[PDB]
């Protein structure tokens, strides 16, 4: 079999990267060696032909490949009804914000401090924990260990139910993803691209 | 307040090791620093002081560190039924293996390979795909796009159900799993370690 090397940041693989790919794997004889990079260093890894596509952030064209944008991947702000109770007892405030227990996946995480910036029109530096995990992101906002900022995909169901609340409804953080793919293997990962493009037209919001 | 450095293989964090740590950020001030090894350098790590703590395989004491053994992580090599179907037509046989699609986690996971020699007294060379994912192995599994080694705490309501079967039923892959503490912190510790050792022995299998 033919290994097919692709990056995905984290999100994705814990929404819906995955439903793509099974889509492609299960019609063809190819294997895949996902690549997870939330080092931003998947602009780097196309570039060196280390993988042949990505999901990403990142729009501008890597040179030479193509760029197909995929949809927007919404993240809500959100912890437990007792962290609340404990940490925001009289509102989310740059006062509180700099003691409450923040959740930050690694040192280039800016979604915290990008929320803070917009719901609350200042930055504020907030304590963390620091959890390179999307699902463990998801379970330390549940178990009341912090407040982060989670994909919906992942925090729907549980805002819901009220197992987490949003800080400040009404205050998602929306980043757009792309899907750059070597424009010497695009046509023959043609396939790929159309279930990474159709699965993400379903789970995304649109352009 | 102070930032613990903690270290986890990704299939404790992806189960138990949140459960514990929350237990003990709720009734402290600590913030942690969760590092994930699946490249198994915690060792170095806990030599180095670049964490005081952690979740590993390692048995054998890091020199100097106090080791309290935590129980074992059971896992069971799982597939969906139509990958079964697809397969494993006539039975998981050596010519079957060689042929179907696993899932290995990265170039150290011996898992598969382990329960292979196992369940069927020899060594198979098996094609992979590469899948550095805890929560991906168990969707990967689920989807049809191949079989792999889960924990048991991820799939045990999928075998249930049927989402998933077992390859060879009755053939888990046992881990012990050990607590590693710098022995100069480990007093000051004591809670945290309380609460990794009471989560453990009500998730993991007795020692
Ligand atoms: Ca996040
Ligand atoms: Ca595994």
């Given at each position: 079999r033919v290994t097919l090397n692709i990056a995905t940041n984290a999100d994705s693989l814990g929404t819906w990267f995955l439903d793509a790919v099974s889509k492609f794997t299960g019609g063809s004889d190819y294997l895949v060696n996902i690549a997870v990079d939330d080092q931003d260093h998947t602009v780097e890894w196309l570039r060196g032909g280390r993988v042949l596509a990505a999901v990403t952030?990142?729009?501008?064209?890597?040179?030479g490949c193509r760029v197909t944008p995929l949809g927007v991947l919404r993240y809500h702000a959100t912890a437990s009804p007792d962290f609340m109770a404990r940490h925001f007892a009289d509102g989310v405030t740059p006062a509180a914000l700099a003691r409450a227990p923040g959740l930050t996946f690694?040192?280039?995480?800016?979604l915290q401090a990008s929320w803070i910036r917009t719901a609350l029109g200042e930055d504020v530096s907030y304590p963390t924990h620091w959890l390179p995990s999307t699902d463990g992101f998801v379970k330390a906002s549940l178990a009341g260990m912090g407040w982060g900022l989670n994909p919906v995909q992942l925090v729907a169901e549980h805002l819901a139910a009220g197992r987490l609340v949003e800080?400040?409804?009404?205050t998602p953080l929306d980043i757009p993803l792309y899907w750059q793919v070597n424009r010497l293997a695009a046509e023959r990962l043609a396939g790929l691209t159309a279930n990474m493009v159709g699965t993400a037209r379903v789970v995304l919001m649109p352009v």
């Open positions: 952030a990142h729009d501008k064209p890597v040179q690694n040192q280039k995480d800016r800080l400040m409804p009404g």
